[PDB]
């Protein structure tokens, strides 16, 4: 695997510069360095390939760059769409394709398009039957990226959680669900629980309680 | 008009073999080197292997060599990926894509252009085997227009159908995608928001339907 930043925020107009950084083997010894961008429902899409040059369709926002064993993608006079993931990929002298782990961008010169949440309680047919299991809807979001908490009173819940991925909602919104399993005993014996839905900087948080 | 089309996704248990296929069209599939990439929900893109579809040669990391088994069909315009023992990590959707022109003088195996993606191929791993949904009602927060729900736990395999009052309301009814469980069952709920003056005296009803273990739910949900 490649290296790149986790993640990188910007704003319109101003620059970005995403970096990747590989070995000798592979960004150092070829001209083959290619970048890739994809959106949420997507397939990845070809930007620049062999290093500098523009694929179809692109504009010069997209500049290609490489420092021995470092690849970059500088961007400029900024837009909007981007909102989403850079992945870098370079030729290896195994005569194989190499890609980074993704730059996951955030953009800002967009309004938004927040999440609509709703919190249920675990149903009392479902307590009856010893299970439990908070549901959390989010739905009308746009970008199509969100993280979901989980939290029993004030503290953090990772286990008994599971979360779709945001898939396109039929009003080119998206929405996605999030899942957190408890004993009953556990539901009873707290406060409450609560889910909390971040999007772009923002969090919606619901909270439910017996 | 350059077009990669991929098979629809699919299941399998933990250690057994898939197979997914990528029809060409608009070009000659063996013209040119086929990529396989993946990428894990939520996760990045892994680079699996290419193939030259004239000679059969192909290449992949030494993570994915013995593992797969890439094959052509040029009188159908085909490729194909076959991955073996499959295992919860092998969980992903699965992309085929062109790359480079194929020529001995020139050799662009190794050039990671793919100026053509298919639409990708979800593979999913389960050990689970058919079961029926336990369908429960969500109630109208009796706070609150109100939203009301089912929720339907713990099925497989896919799809559940859901339509509310055998379809006399559709107005704000929104059926989630099912989320696939770590335990290998599928959940989903659907909602529908409705004017809460109206609790108390419409009654409502999720009509849950699971053709592949043959059972139909009509739960009445009420505050």
């Known amino acids: 695997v490649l290296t790149q930043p986790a993640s990188v925020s910007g704003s319109p107009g101003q620059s970005i510069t995403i970096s990747c950084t590989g070995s000798s083997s592979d960004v150092g010894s070829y001209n083959l360095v290619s970048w890739y961008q994809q959106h949420p429902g997507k397939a990845p899409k070809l930007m620049i390939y062999?290093?500098?040059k523009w694929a179809s369709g692109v504009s010069d926002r997209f500049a290609g760059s490489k420092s021995g064993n470092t690849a970059s993608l500088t961007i400029s006079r900024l837009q909007a769409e981007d909102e989403a993931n850079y992945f870098c990929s370079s030729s290896t002298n195994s005569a194989t394709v190499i890609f980074g782990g993704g730059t996951k961008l955030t953009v800002l010169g967009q309004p938004k398009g927040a999440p609509s949440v709703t919190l249920f309680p675990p149903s009392s047919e479902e307590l009856q039957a010893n299970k439990a299991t908070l549901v959390c809807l989010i739905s009308d979001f746009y970008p199509g990226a969100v993280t979901v908490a989980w939290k029993a009173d004030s503290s953090p819940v990772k286990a008994g959680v599971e979360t779709t991925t945001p898939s396109k909602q039929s009003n080119n919104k998206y929405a996605a669900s999030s899942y957190l399993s408890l004993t009953p005993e556990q539901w009873k014996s707290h406060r409450s629980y609560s889910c909390q839905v971040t999007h772009e900087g923002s969090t919606v948080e619901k909270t439910v309680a017996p | 008009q350059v077009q990669l089309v991929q098979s629809g996704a699919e299941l399998k248990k933990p250690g057994a073999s898939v197979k997914v296929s990528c029809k060409a069209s608009?070009?000659?599939?063996?013209?040119?080197?086929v990529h396989w990439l993946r990428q894990a929900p939520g996760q990045g893109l892994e680079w699996v292997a290419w193939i030259n579809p004239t000679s059969g040669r192909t290449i992949s990391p030494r993570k994915f060599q013995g593992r797969v088994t890439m094959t052509t069909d040029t009188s159908m315009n085909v490729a194909y990926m076959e991955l073996r023992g499959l295992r919860s990590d092998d969980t992903a959707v699965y992309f085929c894509?062109?790359?480079?022109?194929?020529?001995?003088?020139?050799?662009?195996?190794?050039?990671?252009?793919?100026?053509?993606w298919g639409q990708g191929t979800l593979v999913s791993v389960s050990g689970a085997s058919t079961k029926g949904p336990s369908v429960f009602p969500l109630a109208p927060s009796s706070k609150s227009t109100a939203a009301l729900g089912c929720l339907v736990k713990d099925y497989f395999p896919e799809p559940v159908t859901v339509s509310w009052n055998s379809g006399a309301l559709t107005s704000g009814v929104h059926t989630f995608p099912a989320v696939l469980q770590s335990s290998g069952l599928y959940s989903l709920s659907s909602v529908v928001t409705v004017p809460s003056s109206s609790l108390g005296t419409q009654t409502y009803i999720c009509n849950v339907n699971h053709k592949p273990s043959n059972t139909k739910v009509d739960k009445r949900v009420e505050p």
């Open positions: 894509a062109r790359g480079g022109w194929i020529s001995l003088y020139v050799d662009y195996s190794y050039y990671p252009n793919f100026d053509s």
């Open positions: 608009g070009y000659t599939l063996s013209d040119y080197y």
């Open positions: 062999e290093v500098n």
